[PDB]
């Protein structure tokens, strides 16, 4: 078999708005979730509100 | 070259010279299993290699639309309906000799008029 061709177009995927916003919105929502958790630790360990 | 495997170890057998009888055996170093050799042959490198030329022949090859068709008749069944393709081994010096594959008897027969 020949060396695999890197430029064969069927092996390249394009990313439109959807996959992009998916990536970015993922890491945003992780950051959000984590922040809510920190707030819970702060209020429960400090018993405020 | 066509080496065997041990029983219940299943591992490959390494050749063992028998100095007592001066004859060749096969040992499995994981156990006591040893059996006799069937040939003095052990190793074959085969630098120049002509095998793999006809590789990839499949029972369904006659259904491939991307393959060209030819009108040359088979030497065996004399059926002129066949599909042809070049040597499957991919190398610089690989010859362009065609391999014609009949659609009746499935036989492989080349186009080379020099050596057959």
């Amino acid at each position: 078999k020949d060396q695999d061709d890197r430029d064969h177009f069927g092996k390249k995927r394009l990313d439109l708005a959807g996959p992009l916003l998916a990536q970015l919105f993922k890491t945003l929502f992780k950051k959000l979730t984590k922040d809510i958790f920190r707030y819970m630790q702060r209020t429960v360990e400090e018993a405020h509100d | 070259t066509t080496f065997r495997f041990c029983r219940d170890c299943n591992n490959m057998l390494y050749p063992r010279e028998d100095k007592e009888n001066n004859r060749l055996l096969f040992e499995c170093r994981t156990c006591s299993y040893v059996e006799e050799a069937g040939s003095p042959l052990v190793y074959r490198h085969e630098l120049i290699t002509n095998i793999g030329e006809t590789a990839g022949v499949v029972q369904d090859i006659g259904s491939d639309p991307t393959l060209p068709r030819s009108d040359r008749e088979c030497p065996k069944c004399h059926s002129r309906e066949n599909v042809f393709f070049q040597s499957q081994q991919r190398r610089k010096d690989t010859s362009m000799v065609l391999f014609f594959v009949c659609l009746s008897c499935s036989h492989i027969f080349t186009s080379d008029q020099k050596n057959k």
Binding site: - | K92, D93, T94, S95, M96, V97, L98, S111, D112, Q113, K114, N115
Partner: protein, 56 residues
């Protein structure tokens, strides 16, 4: 002009014909490559040769 056109036409056609023959020969392993050149190298080399000769 037309007579030139047909003349060009055939002048190409025969070139293709030569190429085709080189093809059949090398398909039959009857071609001998120039030394230092691989078989398929000598094949391409010839085919291109004929072609550029034709265009010219």
């Amino acid at each position: 002009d037309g007579p030139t056109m047909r003349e060009i036409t055939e002048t190409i056609a025969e070139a293709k014909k030569k190429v085709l023959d080189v093809t059949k020969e090398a398909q039959a392993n009857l071609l001998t490559a120039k030394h230092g050149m691989t078989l398929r190298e000598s094949f391409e080399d010839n085919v291109v040769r004929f072609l550029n000769e034709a265009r010219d």
